[PDB]
Amino acid sequence: GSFFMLNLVLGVLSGEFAKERERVENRRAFLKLRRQQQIERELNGYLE
């Protein structure tokens, strides 16, 4: 009732999060977040 149920809930929630993380609306925002970080990384060296 406690350990098995919590394991099942934990697994189902992690699977749901993994499935949702690869939708287009979230992947498109992650790509933007990565692109801005990449631009800043280059701009640092250029101001140097």
Binding site: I39, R41, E42, L43, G45, Y46, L47, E48
Partner: protein, 199 residues
Amino acid sequence: KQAEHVPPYDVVPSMRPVVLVGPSLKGYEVTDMMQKALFDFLKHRFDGRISITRVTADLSLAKRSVLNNPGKRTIIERSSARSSIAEVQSEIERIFELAKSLQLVVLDADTINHPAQLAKTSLAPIIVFVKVSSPKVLQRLIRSRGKSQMKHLTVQMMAYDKLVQCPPESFDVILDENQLEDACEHLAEYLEVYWRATH
């Protein structure tokens, strides 16, 4: 077939001049500093074996087969006698004789913004491209200067994109690293290879 008569042999300078192009118009803060840093690195690393001089006069008109002598005398008061073309040719022989000295030469002329403007001449200089990864980084950099460069940001972006559209085979070396050091040792290694090759 004497309409053009391209000669098989041309007398190029003994040592190919080193010229920087990009990432924007020469004469604006970003380009001047981006090139100044490399010039200082080259002077310091190759001290005692390199000569660097600024070429104030124009250079894009390094022709060979225009006429026997366009403007031989300055007192003719002709269209070319009163012009500054003779200054360009005089700088051409100056570069030729300095390359004759066998020591490395680097040009600081502010009239180069595309290798295609100096590809059909006799000098055939070593084109060095200091490119910026993306337009956003360049325009951010320009914004970091102030309003004075914000005024010319439009033409700076235009020249940047036009020079990027130039294909890589047009240039001789590329400097795309965002770190000043890595580009410095890249150029240093290339010039060390050139020095070891011509000795």
